[PDB]
Amino acid sequence: SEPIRVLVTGAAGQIAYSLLYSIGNGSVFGKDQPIILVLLDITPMMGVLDGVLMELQDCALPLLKDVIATDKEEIAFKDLDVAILVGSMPRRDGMERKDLLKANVKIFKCQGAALDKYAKKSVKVIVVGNPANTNCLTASKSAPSIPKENFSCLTRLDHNRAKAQIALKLGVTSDDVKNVIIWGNHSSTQYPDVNHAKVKLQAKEVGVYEAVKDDSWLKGEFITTVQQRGAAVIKARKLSSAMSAAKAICDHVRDIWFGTPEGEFVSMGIISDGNSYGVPDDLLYSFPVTIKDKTWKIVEGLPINDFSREKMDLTAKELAEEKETAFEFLSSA
Amino acid sequence: SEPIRVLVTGAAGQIAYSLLYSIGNGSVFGKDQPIILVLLDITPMMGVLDGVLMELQDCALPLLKDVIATDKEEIAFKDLDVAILVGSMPRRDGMERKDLLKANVKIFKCQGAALDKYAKKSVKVIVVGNPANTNCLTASKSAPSIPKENFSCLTRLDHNRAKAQIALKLGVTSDDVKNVIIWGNHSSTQYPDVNHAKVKLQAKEVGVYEAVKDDSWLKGEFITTVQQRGAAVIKARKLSSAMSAAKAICDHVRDIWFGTPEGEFVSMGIISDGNSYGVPDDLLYSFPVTIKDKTWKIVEGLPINDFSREKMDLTAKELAEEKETAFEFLSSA
Ligand SMILES: NC(=O)c1ccc[n+]([C@@H]2O[C@H](COP(=O)([O-])OP(=O)(O)OC[C@H]3O[C@@H](n4cnc5c(N)ncnc54)[C@H](O)[C@@H]3O)[C@@H](O)[C@H]2O)c1
Ligand SMILES: NC(=O)c1ccc[n+]([C@@H]2O[C@H](COP(=O)([O-])OP(=O)(O)OC[C@H]3O[C@@H](n4cnc5c(N)ncnc54)[C@H](O)[C@@H]3O)[C@@H](O)[C@H]2O)c1
Numbered sequence: 001s002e003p004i005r006v007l008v009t010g011a012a013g014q015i016a017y018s019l020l021y022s023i024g025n026g027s028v029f030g031k032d033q034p035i036i037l038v039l040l041d042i043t044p045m046m047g048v049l050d051g052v053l054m055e056l057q058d059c060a061l062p063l064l065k066d067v068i069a070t071d072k073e074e075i076a077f078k079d080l081d082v083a084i085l086v087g088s089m090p091r092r093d094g095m096e097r098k099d100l101l102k103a104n105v106k107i108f109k110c111q112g113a114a115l116d117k118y119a120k121k122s123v124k125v126i127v128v129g130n131p132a133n134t135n136c137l138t139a140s141k142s143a144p145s146i147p148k149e150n151f152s153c154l155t156r157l158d159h160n161r162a163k164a165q166i167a168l169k170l171g172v173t174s175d176d177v178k179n180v181i182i183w184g185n186h187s188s189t190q191y192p193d194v195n196h197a198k199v200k201l202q203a204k205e206v207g208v209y210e211a212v213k214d215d216s217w218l219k220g221e222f223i224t225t226v227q228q229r230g231a232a233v234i235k236a237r238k239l240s241s242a243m244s245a246a247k248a249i250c251d252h253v254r255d256i257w258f259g260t261p262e263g264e265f266v267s268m269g270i271i272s273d274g275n276s277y278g279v280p281d282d283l284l285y286s287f288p289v290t291i292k293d294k295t296w297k298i299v300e301g302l303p304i305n306d307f308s309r310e311k312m313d314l315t316a317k318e319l320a321e322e323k324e325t326a327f328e329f330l331s332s333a
Numbered sequence: 334s335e336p337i338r339v340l341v342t343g344a345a346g347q348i349a350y351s352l353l354y355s356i357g358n359g360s361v362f363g364k365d366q367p368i369i370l371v372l373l374d375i376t377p378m379m380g381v382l383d384g385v386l387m388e389l390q391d392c393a394l395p396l397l398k399d400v401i402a403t404d405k406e407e408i409a410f411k412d413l414d415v416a417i418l419v420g421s422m423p424r425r426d427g428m429e430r431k432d433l434l435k436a437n438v439k440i441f442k443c444q445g446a447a448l449d450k451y452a453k454k455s456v457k458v459i460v461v462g463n464p465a466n467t468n469c470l471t472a473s474k475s476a477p478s479i480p481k482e483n484f485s486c487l488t489r490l491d492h493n494r495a496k497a498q499i500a501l502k503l504g505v506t507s508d509d510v511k512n513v514i515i516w517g518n519h520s521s522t523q524y525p526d527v528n529h530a531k532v533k534l535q536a537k538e539v540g541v542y543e544a545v546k547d548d549s550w551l552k553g554e555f556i557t558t559v560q561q562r563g564a565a566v567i568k569a570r571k572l573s574s575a576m577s578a579a580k581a582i583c584d585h586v587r588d589i590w591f592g593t594p595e596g597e598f599v600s601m602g603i604i605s606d607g608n609s610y611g612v613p614d615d616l617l618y619s620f621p622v623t624i625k626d627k628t629w630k631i632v633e634g635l636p637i638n639d640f641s642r643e644k645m646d647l648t649a650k651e652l653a654e655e656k657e658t659a660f661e662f663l664s665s666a
């Protein structure tokens with residue numbers, strides 16, 4: 001197959017350091033799919049990039065057709081098929097994802113403008129840098145010639161985190177848990193919804209509530225754990241998550257590239273235009289979706305209880321607030 | 334279908350951060366091999382170690398059955414099926430990763446002692462932390478009940494780098510290169526030998542001397558390039574060569590676990606007793622081996638030309654010296 005052009009921004013940083021190996025080894029786009037890898041970062045990090053290039057050569061990765069290290073937008077965004085937007089200022093212990101907004105939203109406006117100008121119209125754009133949803137939304141709106149649908153942000157890490165807490169609670173495997181949902185914002189108001197989740201017990205596959213038999217936990221400690229998870233990792237490590245962040249990016253892009261498995265949906269921040277869940281349009285909200293032929297579709301018919309109604313509305317409300325701040329700031333100049 | 338117990342020491346830093354995902358991924362011990370990862374680091378790094386533990390859980394790895402974090406030797410080394418020894422004292426620019434001997438060999442003396450008392454007798458121990466060969470030797474000497482053959486250190490990174498250099502020189506792929514050999518010490522006197530090595534050049538296996546047609550380069554710049562590679566990545570990145578080291582450690586441990594491909598030998602530091610290559614007995618030196626049923630076997634009968642003889646001998650002298658220096662210290666008290 002002809003090579004696909006995949007860009008990873010902030011390529012000299014931690015997340016990228018934990019991710020380039022998985023792209024180059026074929027575990028993301030396919031064991032036989034060659035990659036033209038494009039690596040963007042700032043001028044003073046170009047020497048770090050060169051160290052990463054020698055390490056890629058020392059890792060035996062033949063699927064890497066070419067590896068382009070650059071600090072130029074013209075080169076970085078040209079003809080891409082995939083854009084992994086990581087390049088961003090990370091928060092530190094004590095900060096919410098919301099400060100970083102003014103600092104980072106400006107970067108995603110220019111990058112959305114760079115995609116629109118230089119990348120293919122078919123590009124898949126994956127936004128990881130914080131605030132992901134708002135960053136996501138801003139970049140998307142500075143790329144009017146690229147379908148809204150090609151813009152996604154990462155809630156897969158929160159998804160994976162929710163599964164790992166279920167597996168640990170029930171003493172099960174991560175793969176035995178399925179259909180946990182991460183609704184709304186990639187922030188501490190995220191709703192990790194296990195109402196439609198399934199767990200494989202030895203006698204039969206049951207609902208997560210039925211298998212846990214602890215409603216308080218599921219609506220209490222379980223919610224807080226997942227929500228504060230990013231902040232807890234930073235508090236311990238003194239660095240943002242990277243190993244777990246990179247892996248969720250691999251899972252998110254693979255599910256885009258290869259589709260979701262029969263009877264299963266995954267969490268994805270996407271544009272909310274047309275949803276049927278009572279969520280305002282024009283937001284970059286995380287929904288449970290099924291993917292096929294690289295195209296996502298929100299899962300419909302999920303029964304929403306009262307407890308889930310509220311929670312879902314609180315993340316949307318929070319997302320509107322971030323939308324208001326970033327748009328006031330980017331127009332003001 | 335039961336799990337195995339693997340220890341990774343120095344779990345709170347660089348190399349381990351790039352390596353643990355590949356262990357719990359199933360890419361080392363097999364896609365149906367469940368693992369319990371045991372992470373060991375010193376007391377002051379327990380904060381950071383808990384965040385790595387959180388990241389590991391957050392990757393949602395079905396095979397990763399349990400993850401344990403401790404600063405206790407009695408917990409780390411209990412009932413291990415595999416021990417990866419990374420923890421140690423660091424290196425950097427200004428040369429060569431020589432002086433570290435006396436500041437790292439105490440660590441490994443202690444660590445062999447714990448394996449001796451707590452570890453299964455069948456443990457496989459891979460020594461990575463520098464001085465790799467001499468730390469290796471010290472640990473085996475302080476663990477007299479665990480078979481000396483069960484101990485090995487890592488020359489696989491130098492071996493992997495060597496293949497990439499040949500691939501680069503010729504314009505071919507790294508996996509088109511077979512049977513390079515890393516003779517000796519993991520240091521600047523190492524001997525990266527290609528006399529017995531093969532390359533697939535234009536769909537025909539030929540002989541790397543035959544393919545390269547530049548004997549001066551193979552005996553000059555290739556050798557120094559492979560010996561100075563680690564220092565070039567570290568001066569470019571300002572951080573260790575973790576991504577490539579993580580990959581060479583997986584190579585080394587997978588080949589131990591599942592054996593070498595038919596027709597192929599790999600490089601790995603082992604106990605020298607009885608070799609037929611003119612190298613002193615009771616040394617931990619790298620040789621070419623074939624591996625079957627988790628048991629290495631030095632490849633006998635390779636003709637040693639004169640250039641090779643002073644080089645293998647030169648590496649040996651250095652290793653003899655490090656042996657002197659390490660043991661007088663440790664016995665001194
Ligand atoms: N959505 C998620 O789950 C998620 C998870 C983890 C981290 N993140 C976020 O991802 C972002 C990436 O930071 P990190 O964790 O890798 O830490 P990091 O600081 O080590 O890496 C960031 C990299 O971005 C580069 N960079 C900065 N501005 C840039 C620009 N304008 N163009 C290109 N590159 C630029 C930096 O030089 C650096 O190399 C942070 O905002 C972090 O909070 C998001
Ligand atoms: N053989 C090879 O090919 C090779 C290649 C690269 C690096 N290395 C060596 O690997 C080692 C690890 O490097 P790194 O980049 O991860 O360094 P690092 O600083 O990032 O990590 C070392 C870790 O060892 C821990 N440690 C120190 N003493 C310990 C002890 N007694 N018990 C347990 N943990 C202890 C430290 O607290 C730290 O967490 C170094 O010795 C490095 O030179 C070997």
Ligand SMILES: O=C(O)C(=O)C(=O)O
Binds near residue numbers: 231
């Ligand atoms: O730390 C953060 O901001 C994250 O988004 C993360 O680690 O998932």
